Every structure is written in structure tokens, then in C-alpha cells.
């Protein structure tokens, strides 16, 4: 039968133009007042998945 997508993974990752994956950064959820503005700002934009854990992501999302 068809491979099932890891649905959590689907929620967290979007495949990009060159076949990478963007994700929202961790740590910008709560406990914010203590985090510096700068840090928060840096966390805001979506970022590419690293070369190391790309494989895992791919495994999770076969249909991507």
C-alpha cells in the first residue's frame, strides 16, 4: 500500500523550489519578554532545514 506521510512533519515543513524544506524557527512561541528583541526578530523568518536532518525530513514526507 501507499506510504503514509508523517502528518506532524507535513504540518511543520514545506518543500521549496530547489527541493529543500523551509520551517518556522523554534523558541518564538512563549517566554518571550526575556528573549531579546533582536533574537526574536531573527527567529521570525522561515529557515531551510540543515543538510544533516534533510534526510530525515525526506523520509517523513515521501510525497513532500
Amino acid at each position: 500500500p501507499k506510504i503514509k506521510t508523517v502528518r506532524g512533519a507535513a504540518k511543520r515543513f514545506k518543500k521549496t523550489g530547489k527541493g529543500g524544506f523551509k520551517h518556522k524557527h523554534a523558541n518564538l512561541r512563549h517566554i518571550l519578554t526575556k528573549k531579546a528583541t533582536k533574537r526574536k526578530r531573527h527567529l521570525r523568518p522561515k529557515a531551510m532545514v540543515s543538510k544533516g536532518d534533510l534526510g530525515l525530513v525526506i523520509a517523513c514526507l515521501p510525497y513532500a
Binding site: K11, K24, V57
Partner: protein, 96 residues
């Protein structure tokens, strides 16, 4: 996505966004595809007939990709600026 007992990359990261239902019923049309239709007139229905867009498509966009040679009359469809220009050059017409 099992990294030993460590919280795996997807569980580590926040979920984001939502899936739009309006996005599933939108379509993207290359200029190269305007030749494949018949009569030189481009409606949604005509596109469907041609088998370019798909049946469950309410909204369609014409994009500057490929090129159009024949004069073409685009009817009730969104056209990007470059694509519009290309159509004009070809000798076409765009009406809403």
C-alpha cells in the same frame, strides 16, 4: 523521524500556517498552453475542454512562461502584466 529518544526534528519544530481551500481551486496557465485551445478564445470552460486546468477549477491565471504566437482572446481570467504584454505583442485581446 526517530532520533533515539531525542525529540525528533518535526516534533521539535512549530507547526505553521493553514491550508487554503481557495488555493486548491486555482490554476496556473503557461502562454504555451493558449495554443492548445480551440477557436482562439480562452475561457475557463474552454481550458477545461482542452484539458489544461482540470474540472474542479474556479479561478485561473495566465503567466509569462513559454510564448504565444497566435492572436488569442482571454475571457474572464486573470493575466499577469508580462503575460498581458506578450499577448498584446502576439496580437491578442484580454477582456474581463
Amino acid at each position: 523521524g526517530f532520533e533515539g529518544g531525542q525529540m525528533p526534528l518535526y516534533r521539535r519544530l512549530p507547526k505553521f500556517g493553514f491550508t487554503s481551500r481557495k488555493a486548491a481551486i486555482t490554476a496556473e496557465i503557461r502562454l504555451s498552453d493558449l495554443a492548445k485551445v480551440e477557436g482562439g478564445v480562452v475561457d475557463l470552460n474552454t481550458l477545461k475542454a482542452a484539458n489544461i486546468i482540470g474540472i474542479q477549477i474556479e479561478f485561473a491565471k495566465v503567466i509569462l512562461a513559454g510564448e504565444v504566437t497566435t492572436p488569442v482572446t482571454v475571457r474572464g481570467l486573470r493575466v499577469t502584466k508580462g503575460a498581458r504584454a506578450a499577448i498584446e505583442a502576439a496580437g491578442g485581446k484580454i477582456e474581463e
